[PDB]
Amino acid sequence: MIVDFYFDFLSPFSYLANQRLSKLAQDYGLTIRYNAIDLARVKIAIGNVGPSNRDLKVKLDYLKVDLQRWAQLYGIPLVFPANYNSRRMNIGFYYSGAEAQAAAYVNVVFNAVWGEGIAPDLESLPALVSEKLGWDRSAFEHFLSSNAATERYDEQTHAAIERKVFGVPTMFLGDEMWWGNDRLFMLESAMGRLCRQNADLSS
Amino acid sequence: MIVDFYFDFLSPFSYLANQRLSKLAQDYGLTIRYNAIDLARVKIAIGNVGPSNRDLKVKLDYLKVDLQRWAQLYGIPLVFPANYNSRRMNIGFYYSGAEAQAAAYVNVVFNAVWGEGIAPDLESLPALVSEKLGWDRSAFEHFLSSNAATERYDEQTHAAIERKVFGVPTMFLGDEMWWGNDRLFMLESAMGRLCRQNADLSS
Ligand SMILES: COc1ccccc1/C(=C\C(=O)C(=O)O)SC[C@H](NC(=O)CC[C@H](N)C(=O)O)C(=O)NCC(=O)O
Ligand SMILES: COc1ccccc1/C(=C\C(=O)C(=O)O)SC[C@H](NC(=O)CC[C@H](N)C(=O)O)C(=O)NCC(=O)O
């Protein structure tokens, strides 16, 4: 079974969604197709140009509380980084190879930025992540500034916009799209219905 | 046990929250303190002046899907009215007396506007609601245009802003605030923890 997952490493709701999706992968063998995309571009595409919730202190104050409530439910830390400059690490997702290493990259980067609060534009973060993954630091860093890397990121952002993705985290199963860590329960219910049909427990 | 509930009849997520809160009231004896407030005013107060999700077609298209998913979970219809001009009916909440009649007003108006799709500024809706509640139509209609009615609505909107309410539906228990029908599960868990402490099942 396959779920398409759309995220931007600036998003703490995406950090939460990735944690829960990774557990489904490891606990149930769910297959995740990862897509790192530019939230800023998807928002401007659909006309969402007003002040971001990041810039509305009273709402951000509550969202910070919501985020801690979910981190406590999930048993994980959640620490705000000093900035939301996720472009380099989003692009770096496209260096990863097959599924294990794609998931490993997404997990290590989310845990660094939102689990530890490491700024996503820290100059040494590509090297730190390379060391963790067993990658060639110099080759990764060269990939990050290459034209082909930006093109792949732009290609995926555009495809997500064509698919009617307006935010992150966004998940698809079949023709159904959910937006939010707080809609993963509906994706899980749809997966169960498909598990039951396939097992002949349901028509 | 008391929950403060903040809603605007323009809000379909508030319609969903009111349905679930009313069931908690009727199934568990939860006490709800209802507050009809002006969403537009609370948004402008915290600086949320960008295009509304109402005006972003691609996001609204998804929100309409989310709304139907929840209406199906809850077993209720949800039908968009022709407009979101909820001021008169919000003000009319302040005609209601004690708890049963306050809940009855909120239920009947939400069911009319979002259960049946009746425009909230329909000129005959105050009379229709009066007939249902056993109220004097002429006295209600006079109340709706009175200065004292607007003042009470403005007073409650202002108090909600002072309380850091930025949207609807908003629920408080004690010092904890949740925003969204999709956070009622956390309010329900907090209520259960308090039920257990009070019963001496937990310290
Ligand atoms: C760094 O971003 C940030 C910090 C703290 C709180 C939220 C955010 C969001 C982004 C932001 O403010 C913008 O840059 O716009 S994360 C991206 C948004 N996701 C959600 O708000 C999911 C909310 C859920 N209810 C859930 O997951 O529980 C997002 O996609 N914004 C687009 C939109 O249309 O709102
Ligand atoms: C008529 O409003 C409407 C129609 C369809 C979909 C949403 C709405 C919302 C309001 C709107 O677009 C504005 O007028 O701004 S309902 C009010 C908002 N509530 C929510 O979006 C709750 C979302 C939850 N995840 C949930 O309940 O599941 C609202 O409070 N907006 C303020 C904000 O800061 O977003």
What are B37's two structure tokens? 């407030």
What are B148's two structure tokens? 């004292």
Residues in B touching A46 (Cβ below 8 Å): 56-59
8 A C-beta contact, residue B198 and residue A92: no
Sign of CA dihedral B87, B92, B98, B102: negative
8 A C-beta contact, residue B33 and residue A140: no
Measured CA to CA, the distance from residue A88 to residue A93 in angstroms comes to: 9
Shortest-distance ligand to the CA of residue A44: 1
Measured CA to CA, the distance from residue B188 to residue B182 in angstroms comes to: 11
Strand partners, A108: none
Contact B182 A179 (CB under 8 A): no
Q: A107 in helix, strand or coil?
A: helix
Closest CA to B90 of B31, B160, B138: B160
Q: Is B182 annotated as a binding residue?
A: yes
Burial class (CB in 10 A: 0-12, 13-18, 19+), B135: buried
The residues of B that are catalytic are 11
Nearest C-alpha of chain A: how many angstroms from B61? 9
Phi-psi group of A118: left, alpha or beta (phi > 0 → left; psi -120 to 50 → alpha; rest → beta): beta
Mutate-to-test residue for ligand 2 from B6, B13, B168, B184, highest number of ligand atoms within 8 A of CB: B13
Which amino acid, residue B30? Answer: L
Nearest C-alpha of chain A: how many angstroms from B51? 6
Which amino acid, residue B158? Answer: H
Q: Which atom of ligand 1 is nearest to the CA of A17?
A: 27
Which residues contact residue A173 at a Cβ distance below 8 angstroms, ignoring those fewer than 6 apart?
A: A1, A2, A3, A187, A190, A191, A194
Strands B2-7, B170-173: pairing kind = antiparallel
Strand partners, A2: A31
DSSP string, chain B: -EEEEEE-TT-HHHHHHHHHHHHHHHHH--EEEEEE--HHHHHHHHT--S--GGG-HHHHHHHHHHHHHHHHHHT------S----HHHHHHGGG--SHHHHHHHHHHHHIIIIIS---TT-TTHHHHHHHHHT--HHHHHHHHHSHHHHHHHHHHHHHHHHTT--SSSEEEETTEEEESGGGHHHHHHHHHHHHHHHTTS--
C-alpha dist (Å) from residue A44 to A158, B51, B165: 12, 12, 27
Structure-determination technique: X-ray
8 A C-beta contact, residue B105 and residue B93: yes
Closest CA to B63 of B76, B52, B48, B74: B52
B6 lines ligand 2 (CB under 6 A): no
Out of B51, B55, B69, closest to residue A186 by CB = B69
Sign of CA dihedral B37, B41, B43, B46: negative
Which residues of B lie closer than 8 Å to A, measured between beta carbons? 46-51, 55-59, 61-62, 65-66, 69, 164, 166-167, 177-180, 182-183, 186
8 A C-beta contact, residue A45 and residue A133: no
Kindly state the DSSP code that residue A122 receives in the 8-state scheme.
-
Nearest C-alpha of chain B: how many angstroms from A56? 6
Task: Give the DSSP H or E segment for A177.
Answer: strand A176-179
Phi-psi group of B180: left, alpha or beta (phi > 0 → left; psi -120 to 50 → alpha; rest → beta): left
Measured CA to CA, the distance from residue A84 to residue B83 in angstroms comes to: 37
Measured CA to CA, the distance from residue B91 to residue B94 in angstroms comes to: 6
Measured CA to CA, the distance from residue B42 to residue B37 in angstroms comes to: 8
Q: A7 in helix, strand or coil?
A: strand
User: For residue A171, how many C-alpha atoms fall within 13 Å in the half-sphere facing its CB?
Assistant: 27
Mutate to test the interface with A, among B56, B57, B67, B182 (most CBs of A within 10 A): B56
Measured CA to CA, the distance from residue A114 to residue A14 in angstroms comes to: 10
| Residue A189: Cβ within 10 Å count | 12
Which amino acid, residue B139? Answer: A
* A57-74 vs A12-28: helix crossing angle, rounded to 10: 20
Q: What angle do CA A183, A181, B38 make, to 5 degrees?
A: 75
8 A C-beta contact, residue A7 and residue A37: yes
Which amino acid, residue A55? Answer: D
What are A117's two structure tokens? 């609060």
Q: How far, in whole angstroms, is CA A137 from its chain's centroid?
A: 23
Measured CA to CA, the distance from residue B105 to residue B22 in angstroms comes to: 12
In the structure, which protein residues have their CB atom closer than 6 angstroms to any atom of ligand 1? A 10-13, 39, 43, 48, 52-54, 63, 84, 166-168, 180-182; B 59
Residues in B touching A179 (Cβ below 8 Å): 62, 66
What are A61's two structure tokens? 């104050």
How many A/B residue pairs have CB atoms within 8 Å? 64
Resolution as reported, in Å: 1.3
B156 lines ligand 2 (CB under 6 A): no
Return the CATH number of B1-203, one of 3.30.540.10, 3.40.605.10, 3.10.450.50, 3.40.30.10.
3.40.30.10
First and final C-alpha spacing in chain B: 18
Which residues contact residue B57 at a Cβ distance below 8 angstroms, ignoring those fewer than 6 apart?
A: A46
Closest residue to atom 33 of ligand 2, CA basis: B167
Measured CA to CA, the distance from residue A49 to residue B58 in angstroms comes to: 14
Kindly state the DSSP code that residue A10 receives in the 8-state scheme.
T
Measured CA to CA, the distance from residue B125 to residue B15 in angstroms comes to: 17
Kindly state the DSSP code that residue A53 receives in the 8-state scheme.
G
